């Protein structure tokens, strides 16, 4: 495709099209191919992320067209996503690694909303770990569920309004997105918090429920979210995770949540414990 770009292997799956490792023959270097059969949102979604295009964090889009009976949009080469790496190290995390991506989770959130946009999807397969001198470096992808948030030029917030359907994955998802409150800044960052605690644990306690509807299941994970006291949750690690779900929680629905307190959280607690930000994570020490 594009006279210069060699088709890949495939290697995944976004919110909608598939993604193959290719290879830009020109530049000797690896990429990653999403394709959508012509004949529509991928011409929509490039646009988002060329409205993207240089924060930290955010993939690099090479090109974009048609190629037969698809549509073809091109990005840079990334490493595994955060849900890879977690299985990796025995879904286990120490302290030291949790507080190292945390950091990192709440500045790329922060930058799409800045861009007039929420992404509606945080979860950690959408977080990819760069490769090589970018291993230190953490990822977000996907801009298909993305909504404007507020008017461009106005910043005049979308209306508030009701029954929205869940746009996004319950388990990560926020009480008021159950609740069919239209989606704003706060709820990709109660996301995160869930996304924490569950790098902390293991797993979260709404994970696993059962349903005969996919419907009736995201009541099921909404009734057990709200039933499941934040001091309960975080029990047994540092009151900083507890703290965190309690802000995020607070926010009302066209506020601007404050990123940089939070971020202060964790790396109090960091210190305290004598870590070091040298970015060894606990799957660089496996042998
Ligand atoms: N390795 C790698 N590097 C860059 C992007 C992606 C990618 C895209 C994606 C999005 C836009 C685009 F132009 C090209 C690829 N959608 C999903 N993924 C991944 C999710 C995790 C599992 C592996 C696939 N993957």
Known sequence: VGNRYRLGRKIGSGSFGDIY??????????????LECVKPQLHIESKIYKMMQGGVGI????????????????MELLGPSLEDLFNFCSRKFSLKTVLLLADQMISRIEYIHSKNFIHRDVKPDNFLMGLGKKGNLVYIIDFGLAKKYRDARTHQHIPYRENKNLTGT???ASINTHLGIE???????????????????????????????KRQKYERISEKKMSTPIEVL???????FATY???????????????????????????????????????????
Not at 187 to 213: C, H, I, R
Request: aromatic content about 16%; proline content about 4%.
């Open 170 to 172: 319950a388990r990560y």
């Open 183 to 213: 989606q704003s800044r706060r709820d990709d960052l109660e996301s995160l918090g869930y996304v924490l605690m569950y790098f902390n644990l293991g797993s979260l306690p709404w994970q696993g429920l059962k349903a005969a509807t």
């Open 59 to 74: 993939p690099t889009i090479r090109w974009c067209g048609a190629e037969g009976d698809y549509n073809v949009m091109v």
């Open 21 to 34: 490792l290719g290879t830009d023959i020109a530049a000797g270097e690896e990429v990653a191919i999403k």
């Open 245 to 287: 779900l309690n802000f995020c929680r607070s926010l009302r629905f066209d506020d601007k949540p404050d990123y940089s307190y939070l971020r202060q959280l964790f790396r109090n607690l960091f210190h305290r414990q004598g870590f070091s930000y040298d970015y060894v994570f606990d799957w660089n020490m496996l042998k």
């Open 234 to 240: 975080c029990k047994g690690y540092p009151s900083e």
